Amino acid sequence: EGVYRIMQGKTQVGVGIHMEGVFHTMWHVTRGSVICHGRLEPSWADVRNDMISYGGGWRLGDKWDDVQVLAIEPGKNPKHVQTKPGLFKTEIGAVTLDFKPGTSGSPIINKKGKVIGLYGNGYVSAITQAERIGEGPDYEVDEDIFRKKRLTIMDLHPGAGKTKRILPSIVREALKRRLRTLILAPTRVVAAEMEEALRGLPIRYQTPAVKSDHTGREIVDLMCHATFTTRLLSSTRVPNYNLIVMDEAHFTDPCSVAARGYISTRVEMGEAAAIFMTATPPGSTDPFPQSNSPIEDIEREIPERSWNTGFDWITDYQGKTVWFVPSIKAGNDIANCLRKSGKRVIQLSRKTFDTEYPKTKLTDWDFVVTTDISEMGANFRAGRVIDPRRCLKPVILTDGPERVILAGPIPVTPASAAQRRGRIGRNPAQEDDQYVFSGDPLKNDEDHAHWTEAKMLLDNIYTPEGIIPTLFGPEREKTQAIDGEFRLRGEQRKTFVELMRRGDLPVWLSYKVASAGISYKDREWCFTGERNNQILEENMEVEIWTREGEKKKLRPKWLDARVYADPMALKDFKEFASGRK
């Protein structure tokens, strides 16, 4: 609504224009900072040309070619100053007008009432502006995205809004339309951030520990992907949501894949509408998508273990980095190494995420060493990503006696790499953020255990219609499994759910045990394995003291790596093997 002085003992630094909802000013003035009124979001900036935008993209009336410079002097007053701009070659026009420092950002007017540039300081003072722009202010316009038997993908991107303006917008619209709305976060921490963004709506958070909750007053349910699925498995009460919204819909975690399959089935039913939010839709394969601010891509050899020299660019870099590693174990290596150098590093994995992410948001740090979990929603105030584009993938060895092993380090998918790189280049920075990476990604992940683990979840979810639910379209071509064969009747089914819910066991594992007719309470299968099935912890053969009072070596019948592939999961499987769980 007009023209403001950028005030910062501390006085006026520059001038900005607020037009059509967006705030415009020179780059040198804010130097990248935020402004206050509450806060003002720095969204866009052409750095070299010297200018920044707040709350969206630039707005223009025309260009030059007879003009006034409404100069807002510091400790002075607005005075309309009219002049003809020079025709200097460089094609940039400019005025011969010298106003004192702090004036930078003043509106230049072609004789109507529409701004055709900004006064740039500074031999002569340019009419600073670029090509036609731009995107759109922090208000959202939507369809038509609520009709039954419809599915929509929003590939949201860190501008205005995102988790900021888009989600509350559709929720406001949904409530206005009396739709029982469900929202799905990948992680508690992302759901928590949803709550602040929604503060003021009837939004109830829903624990996994509760199998269903119902009020019959207009409410909006907020849960983790896995909460949904486990409720779909254990609750008898199909709640008939008509709008389902999935934030970060690219999560290939089986509870996610499952959720997506069920949801897609409700849509085809005619029963639901669905919205899937993600920058990398399942089936997408660009590892270099567009981004809100410029990213410098840098292809360079990166340490996979400790190092002592020739990697100066690492330690020399004067800011916060994100480093994706293929594993907790690899991460210790790198952290251990970084710490030699006197670097504040925070480590993240699935298990530790909920208690260790907030440390990144709330304290002075130098490095994050993260597994791929940070591909789901993770938000960082960092400048550089270091991404060796590697990972471990669980595979069911079909080659004789079945087992799950952590294969790799193998290279990541294009999508996974897009997401890792997608940590960076959200906020305008003085230097373009840096994506430092190594190797090409690989797209064939069809032997990934998660696909069949999903079908295991999926075809054990029962619908009143009697339809077996199935994988979301683009994800169907990832198994040759036939719909329904993993279905498990009787209380083999109930066991299969319990082991997952209370036993904390992976899907595949949970499956093999239930379908053998083993009762949850029974734990002998943890000890009746073949010699080559012996678990080891830090290089010693694991022994555990039973609830009936015996020492036996940890040797399960069916071997699934994910129980023994990081102390925290292994601490757990030990408690299960006891009978504490």
Binding site: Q8, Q68, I72, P107
Partner: peptide
């Protein structure tokens, strides 16, 4: 607080 605003004028002829 680090920087704020103050409405000075409006866009005119």
């Amino acid at each position: 607080a680090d920087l704020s605003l103050e409405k000075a004028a409006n866009v005119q002829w």
